[PDB]
Amino acid sequence: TRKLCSLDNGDCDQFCHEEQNSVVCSCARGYTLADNGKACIPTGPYPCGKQTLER
């Protein structure tokens, strides 16, 4: 079975690009690509796109 960004966003948290024929995940500013190369880790307490909820 072969498929990339079209398959569940390539398992990427955010941006998904297909380079060489492989999935390459990336993140918006304020986030760092996690070690698993898929998740986006916030660099601060108020990363973009996150609701500021508490309860």
Partner: protein
């Protein structure tokens, strides 16, 4: 916003409100970073001089969470024209940086291709603002949000009495009485993806509000990502 719901604490933190000399809101905006606000080019005519208020949810009673910011630079798309309302977009650079906190945070700017294939294809987006809650009425004192379905361009053009350019997109309901309205202009249209909200549109115009057989028209953010990035670097 006609219909929809009230933005509860922290639910719409990227919402900005453009306020006139009398400190009254007349248009919305979207926080993009500590120094930049995204809004509609046409909103710049609703006031000679204006400031930006963030963190507000209820224009009535000031609760200390609000913050007012002066505008240092106004960057209006040179191609905007009231004749067609095409290129209805502008970026504002504030004189002082926004302090992110409860109810104050930027919405993410997506990448063009990904946004078009992953965001624009979602079933719905969310629009918010302090605009009118009825085609005929006063501006809402409370910030509201509304889930709006993306409308395929075909239905969009057929339903519209005016030209829908490729810089615009339709969202909303055919008959259901929910839609953005006067006053929401310049405000955020965001799309959620894996718990992260990305700016996908700018409330632009519409034929009335929540009118049957009509939809809300938005500036397509993906069509101006390069322009936006360019504007956020002095140019």
């Amino acid at each position: 916003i006609v219909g929809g719901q009230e933005c509860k604490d922290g639910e719409c933190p990227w919402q900005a409100l453009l306020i006139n000399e009398e400190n009254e809101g007349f248009c919305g905006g979207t926080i993009l970073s500590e120094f930049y606000i995204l809004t509609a080019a046409h909103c710049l005519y609703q006031a000679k001089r204006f400031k930006v208020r963030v963190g507000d949810r209820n224009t009535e009673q000031e609760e200390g969470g609000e913050a007012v910011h002066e505008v240092e630079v106004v960057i209006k798309h040179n191609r905007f024209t009231k004749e067609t309302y095409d290129f209805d977009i502008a970026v504002l650079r504030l004189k002082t940086p926004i302090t992110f906190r409860m109810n104050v945070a930027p919405a993410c700017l997506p990448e063009r291709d990904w946004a078009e294939s992953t965001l624009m294809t979602q079933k719905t987006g969310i629009v918010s603002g302090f605009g009118r809650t009825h085609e005929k009425g006063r501006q809402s004192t409370r910030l509201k949000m509304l889930e709006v379905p993306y409308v395929d361009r075909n239905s969009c053009k057929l339903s519209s009495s005016f030209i829908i350019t490729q810089n615009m997109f339709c969202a909303g309901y055919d008959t259901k009485q929910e839609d953005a309205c006067q006053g929401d202009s310049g405000g955020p249209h965001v799309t959620r993806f894996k718990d992260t909200y990305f700016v996908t549109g700018i409330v632009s115009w519409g034929e009335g509000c929540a009118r049957k057989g009509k939809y809300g028209i938005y500036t397509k953010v993906t069509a101006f990502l390069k322009w936006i990035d360019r504007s956020m670097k002095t140019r």
